[PDB]
Amino acid sequence: NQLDARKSAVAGFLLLLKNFKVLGSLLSVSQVHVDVHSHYNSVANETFCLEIMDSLRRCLSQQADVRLMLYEGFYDVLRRNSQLANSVMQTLLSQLKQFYEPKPDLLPPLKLEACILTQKISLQEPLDYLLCCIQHCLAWYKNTVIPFYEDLDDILESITNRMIKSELEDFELKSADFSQSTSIGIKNNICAFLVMGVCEVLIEYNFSISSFSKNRFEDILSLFMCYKKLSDILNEKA
Amino acid sequence: RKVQVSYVIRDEVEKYNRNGVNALQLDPALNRLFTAGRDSIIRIWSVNQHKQDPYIASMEHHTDWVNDIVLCCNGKTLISASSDTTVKVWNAHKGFCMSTLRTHKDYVKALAYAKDKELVASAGLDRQIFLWDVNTLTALTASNNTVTTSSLSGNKDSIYSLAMNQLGTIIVSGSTEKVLRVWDPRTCAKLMKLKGHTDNVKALLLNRDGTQCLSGSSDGTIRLWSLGQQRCIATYRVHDEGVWALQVNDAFTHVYSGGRDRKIYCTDLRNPDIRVLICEEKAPVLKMELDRSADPPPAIWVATTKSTVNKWTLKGIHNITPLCTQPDQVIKGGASIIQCHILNDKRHILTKDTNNNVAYWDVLKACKVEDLGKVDFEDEIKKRFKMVYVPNWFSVDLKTGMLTITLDESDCFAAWVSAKDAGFSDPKLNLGGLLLQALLEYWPRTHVVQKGNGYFQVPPHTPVIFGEAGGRTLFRLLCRDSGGETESMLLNETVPQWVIDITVDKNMPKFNKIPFYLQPHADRLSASDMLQVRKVMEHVYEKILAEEKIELLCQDQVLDPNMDLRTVKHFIWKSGGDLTLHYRQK
């Protein structure tokens, strides 16, 4: 139950699961271990590995530090264990649904207020880092395991177009407070980093998809201007 | 402890016993006989008279003498005890080892079985008696591998025999204490201390209800005990030497005994006067098994120190000249290697077996070269003598009647031999390093892809055994099985560093150096042990065509130019100081 120790457990499983494709084994006063000569079972190992990933999925509801490790670690895990690729995407897609506005015309594309925890205003969900892990894992998926994925491109394409047509006011951000002491100023600064981080990830995404097509590159420049304009307003005030 | 690497030079299929048989178990449902051989292999035989080839399967997972076996759970499970200090659970229908119990600290010699409770007890030379429930043992899995142990105590010397009753309420132990200790397996409480034997007891029997006990001892007497009265109610002296095997009928009125005198008798318990000499075996009787298909038992199976198992009919006992002269049914047995000689090259071995046949073996290739028939063993050693010296790099043990070669860190890499001197066509070769790479050839961790040492290959079926020096067997596998997922994971934990250095890191062992003195015949020099006399000859020549003008001497004897310094130090030198060589012009 004690916190700050489950963080080490998450780090232990992540490091242990991103490095080893095979995990698991092959007492009281009068209890002894018996050398059972049982062959290695792939099905038993897959169930063992899947159960660990299910335990890691439950940790996506903890502090933002724990979520940060999992987003950074899922890409390594998915490259080591290809059998857990399906588990990662369902785990990642479900988390995106908690913050993605599926309505095809409501702006902004993401609920930036749902990533914020107020009790002191802090950050609860690194949404930009979540999208970065999704984009990299999906890119690895569509180029490695093929020779949800058809829906992940649809969502990322939807986030791409709606973020461009967003008027930079739907995020509640030219300069409302942007202060380092007021609660609303701190929240806006934290929310400013997320939208800039999302723009960077989608800039990376639209570069590879559809190859070197003009339309996607026009969307990168407009995405960059969304990032650059909000970068300028935060730099000049601070 | 230090981990040793050992392997067995054998055939893929050892159909017949290569040593004596310690225990017997008969399956009446399938008409199958189990033999616990001294060659570390349990075999299943069909006792049907029609089958000209009774061989069925070989249960090969032990590494030393198999001392006792019990067939439990209606012939579905076999428990075995062995001199490798382990108790093993087997699938008697398929013939594979399921689990290994490592609770004993010394040789495990006895196995007791209670049919009603499915309770099995194992006792050995560590003075311990452990109780096991077979259903719990058989239910063990990879995750469920923990068992609670209930061990009897009170015995002050090594147990040689063990018995329980049918109902699983009485257990009796025989040892070199010369006394019989009785417990209750349910409560693990001491009951009584029977006394009267004057030597070690190797045979124990009990009736169905566990009120009477039969014991045979090395003193040559059979004693019938009453557990109710805690006294010896009868003593039978029908054997000249120690009694080693006992069998009784279902009515518990006739006892069948055999021992070192090689004679088997049927004695009535009610009156010892009625005694029948069943047969006279060709070897001391180690164990006997009664055929309980009919009452009286039609026949008895007898295991001796020989590799042959015989069945003797018992038709006419109740109807000295022996009753039988030839066994009704005979199970064939192989030959046991009893003599061994390592030749001067430390690569070939001459062996002589119990059939007096002499064979030529290649240790490095782990195979037999040729059969030499019944040629005199000492003469063949002289006819194959060679004036070469190679340091010892392996040891040979014949405990199982087969060739087992052991490799130790102390001297595994002591033998550097040139390729030309060996059969491989000259770069220098280490015999121990090459053998280790061939033994672990299939191990993926040794791949950098090429496989093995690139000169030779041991047979794929070669059993490679990893064990502690004078200890327990860590891991046993065949040579070809190193590539499997289970074996490779187990190899990573058992293979010691001194084997990793050569087979994985591909490091090269040390080169032994022998310093020697050059003095003029009428400046100390240190050289490799493999250096030829020619190299020393030419060095003196440059100091003062080299072959023709210079002759080297040691102990006032001429040195062959092709002979090496290592050979010179061993044979010619005959001194305990640094090798001195004397140079003089031809």
B324 contacts B308 by C-beta, under 8 angstroms: no
B18 contacts B338 by C-beta, under 8 angstroms: no
d(CA A96, CA A111): 10
B264 contacts B257 by C-beta, under 8 angstroms: yes
CB-defined contacts A:B, below 8 A: 59
Burial class (CB in 10 A: 0-12, 13-18, 19+), B583: buried
Task: For chain B, say whether A214 makes contact (Cβ under 8 Å).
Answer: no
Task: For chain A, say whether B321 makes contact (Cβ under 8 Å).
Answer: no
B141/A26 touch (CB, cutoff 8 Å), yes or no: no
Instruction: For chain A, count helices (H), then strands (E).
Output: 8, 4
Spatial CA neighbour of B286 closest among B55, B78, B17, B68: B68
Nearest chain B residue to A26 by CA distance is B142
- φ, ψ dihedrals at B272, nearest 5°: -70, -10
SS3 B370: strand
B19 contacts B54 by C-beta, under 8 angstroms: no
Burial class (CB in 10 A: 0-12, 13-18, 19+), B122: buried
C-alpha angle B348-B349-B353 in degrees, rounded to nearest 5: 155
**Closest partner CB to A34 (pick from B61, B140, B486):** B140
| Mutate: best of B63, B80, B485, partner A, most A CBs <10 A | B485
Model resolution, angstroms: 2.8
Distance (Å) from the alpha carbon of A74 to chain B's nearest alpha carbon: 26
Q: Which of residues 34-73 of B touch A (CB under 8 A)?
A: 61
- Residue B207: both structure tokens together: 């009736």
Kindly list the distances between the CA atom of residue B334 and the CA atoms of A11, A87, A120, B41, B337, in Å, as whole numbers in the listed order: 60, 58, 87, 13, 10
d(CA B70, CA B1): 32
Beta-carbon-side half-sphere exposure of residue A128 (alpha carbons within 13 Å): 16
B99/A36 touch (CB, cutoff 8 Å), yes or no: yes
**Closest partner CB to A36 (pick from B145, B484, B490):** B145
Spatial CA neighbour of B16 closest among B367, B328, B306, B299: B306
Nearest chain A residue to B141 by CA distance is A36
SS3 string, A30-93, reads CEEECEECCCCCHHHHHHHHHHHHHHHHHHHHCCHHHHHHHHHHHHHHHHHCCCCHHHHHHHHH
- Residue B352: both structure tokens together: 């002589």
Residue corresponding to tokens 């071995």: B349
* Structure determination technique employed: cryo-EM
Spatial CA neighbour of B205 closest among B150, B260, B248, B263: B248
- Residue A10: both structure tokens together: 């998450």
- Residue B443: both structure tokens together: 């191990």
A34/B99 touch (CB, cutoff 8 Å), yes or no: yes
B146/A33 touch (CB, cutoff 8 Å), yes or no: yes
B101/A34 touch (CB, cutoff 8 Å), yes or no: yes
Cβ partners under 8 Å of residue B400, min gap 6? B8, B18, B19, B38, B39, B40, B64, B65
Spatial CA neighbour of A60 closest among A69, A52, A48, A51: A69
- Residue A214 is inside which H or E element, if any? helix A214-237
A35/B145 touch (CB, cutoff 8 Å), yes or no: yes
| Mutate: best of B146, B466, B475, B482, partner A, most A CBs <10 A | B146
Burial class (CB in 10 A: 0-12, 13-18, 19+), B54: buried
Task: For chain A, say whether B372 makes contact (Cβ under 8 Å).
Answer: no
- Residue A39: both structure tokens together: 């062959």
Task: For chain B, say whether A40 makes contact (Cβ under 8 Å).
Answer: yes
Q: How many CB atoms lie within 10 A of CB B31?
A: 15
**β-bridge partners, B313:** B299
**Closest partner CB to A35 (pick from B99, B148, B489):** B99
**β-bridge partners, B175:** B159
A30/B148 touch (CB, cutoff 8 Å), yes or no: yes
A37/B485 touch (CB, cutoff 8 Å), yes or no: no
Spatial CA neighbour of B394 closest among B353, B366, B354: B366
B69 contacts B85 by C-beta, under 8 angstroms: no
Binning chain B into helix, strand and coil, the percentages to the nearest 5 are: 10, 40, 45
